[PDB]
From a paper:
In this study, we characterised the TphC SBP that is a key component in the cellular uptake of TPA, the breakdown product of PET plastic. As with the tripartite ATP-independent periplasmic (TRAP) class of SBP-dependent transporters, they are symporter proteins driven by an electrochemical ion-gradient, rather than ATP as per the SBP-dependent class of ABC transporters. Here, we report the biochemical and structural characterisation of TphC in both open and TPA-bound closed conformations. This analysis demonstrates the narrow ligand specificity of TphC towards aromatic para-substituted dicarboxylates, such as TPA and closely related analogues.
Purified TphC was readily co-crystallised in the presence of 2 mM TPA and crystals diffracted to 2.4 Å resolution. The general architecture of the previously reported TTT-SBPs is maintained in the TphC–TPA structure. Superposition of the open and closed TphC structures highlights an ~36° closure between the two domains upon TPA binding. Upon closure the solvent accessible surface area of TphC decreases from 13,048 to 12,495 Å2 encapsulating a closed cavity of 280 Å3 in which the TPA is bound. The TPA carboxylate group buried deepest within the pocket is recognised and stabilised through direct (T155, T242) and water-mediated hydrogen bonds (T155, Q150, N197). The second carboxyl group of the TPA hydrogen bonds to the backbone amino groups of A36 and with additional water-mediated interactions with the backbones of G34, S31 and T179. The binding pocket is bordered on one side by a conserved aromatic residue (F30); the positioning of this sidechain is facilitated by the proximity of a conserved glycine (G178). Unlike other TTT-SBPs characterised to date, the ligand site of TphC contains bulky amino acids P86 and Q150, the sidechains of which create a very narrow pocket 6.4 Å across, which would appear to confer the observed selectivity toward planar aromatic ligands.
Author numbering: 28 to 321
């Protein structure tokens, strides 16, 4: 078709939600006469761009590349959504990535223990950025507060990218971002990452310990980036698109870029993708209850 493939990322450009489909989009451009364009449609925790793709023609030329918010979390948190995430047509999972605790380095804090005490001394004073209500950074922050007894004031953003800008600029204190987008700044000293919310360390930040190592093993928060087609999209179209992307994800160049920012390439078929989204939808639903989020 002379039309381009429209991949909608419902978060600000500059974060992991943007860069992973963008890297893959470049590899699959030869598959489409009209090309492959990324469209950034941020706002409302990813629901604006999500609603946009949800209403798009089910022809497989408009798709949503999104982290879990609009995919597996928002419908169990928001009072009413204009779309039903259980009706997405799964294409594939691009990658899973662990979340980490990022702080502004100018805070008088160099460890988790110091941070917890620093927040407990003044409840509500320490501000925590999020990528929007229902994002994993939101639920990971709430998860953290439940386990530690700290009280952080949530500040939502249209994505990781504007949140990091403010964090580095001293306008927001902490951020439970995913490691991929924050590691770039940690190496340059622009931020300080205190811990990884995963069972193993990440090899891009070998010195940053897991929460579990720091004796907070209940801090387990791994996000994932999915590709979904509008409701009604045929299984053939979704499968042909997942194969195109699975081919991209298997190349050395993409594996290298993914590996180097701590992203784990997946590329599963739509059926395994569908199961995984069910498993994750259930996982985060329990986090919603256990930390009662809002
Ligand atoms: O919900 C998440 O985990 C998530 C949200 C936004 C972004 C981004 O703005 O790149 C990345 C991850």
């Amino acid at each position: 078709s002379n039309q381009p493939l429209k991949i909608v990322v419902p978060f600000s450009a500059g974060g992991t939600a943007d860069v992973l489909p963008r890297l893959v989009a470049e590899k699959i451009r030869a598959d489409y006469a009209g090309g492959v364009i990324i469209e950034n449609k941020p706002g409302a925790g990813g629901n604006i761009g999500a609603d946009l793709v949800f209403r798009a023609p089910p022809d497989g030329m408009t798709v949503l590349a999104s982290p879990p918010g609009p995919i597996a979390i928002n419908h169990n948190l928001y009072q009413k959504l204009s779309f039903d995430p259980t009706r997405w047509v799964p294409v594939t999972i691009l990658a899973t990535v662990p979340n980490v605790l990022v702080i502004n380095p100018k805070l008088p804090v160099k460890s988790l223990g110091e941070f917890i005490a620093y927040a407990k001394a003044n409840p509500k004073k320490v501000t925590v950025a999020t990528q929007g209500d229902g994002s994993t950074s939101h639920l990971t922050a709430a998860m953290f507060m439940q386990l530690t007894g700290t009280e952080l004031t949530v500040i939502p953003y249209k994505g990781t990218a504007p949140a990091l800008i403010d964090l580095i600029g001293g306008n927001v204190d902490v951020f439970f971002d995913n490691i991929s987008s924050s590691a770039t700044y940690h190496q340059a000293g622009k931020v300080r990452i205190l811990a990884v919310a995963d069972e193993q360390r990440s090899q891009i930040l070998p010195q940053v310990p897991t929460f579990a190592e720091q004796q907070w093993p209940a801090m387990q928060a791994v996000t994932f980036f999915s590709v979904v087609a509008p409701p009604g999209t045929s299984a053939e179209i979704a499968q042909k698109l997942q194969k195109q992307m699975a081919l991209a994800l298997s190349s050395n160049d993409i594996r290298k870029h993914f590996q180097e920012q701590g992203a784990v390439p997946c590329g599963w078929d739509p059926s395994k993708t569908a199961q995984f989204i069910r498993q994750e939808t259930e996982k985060w639903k329990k986090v919603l209850k256990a930390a009662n989020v809002k």
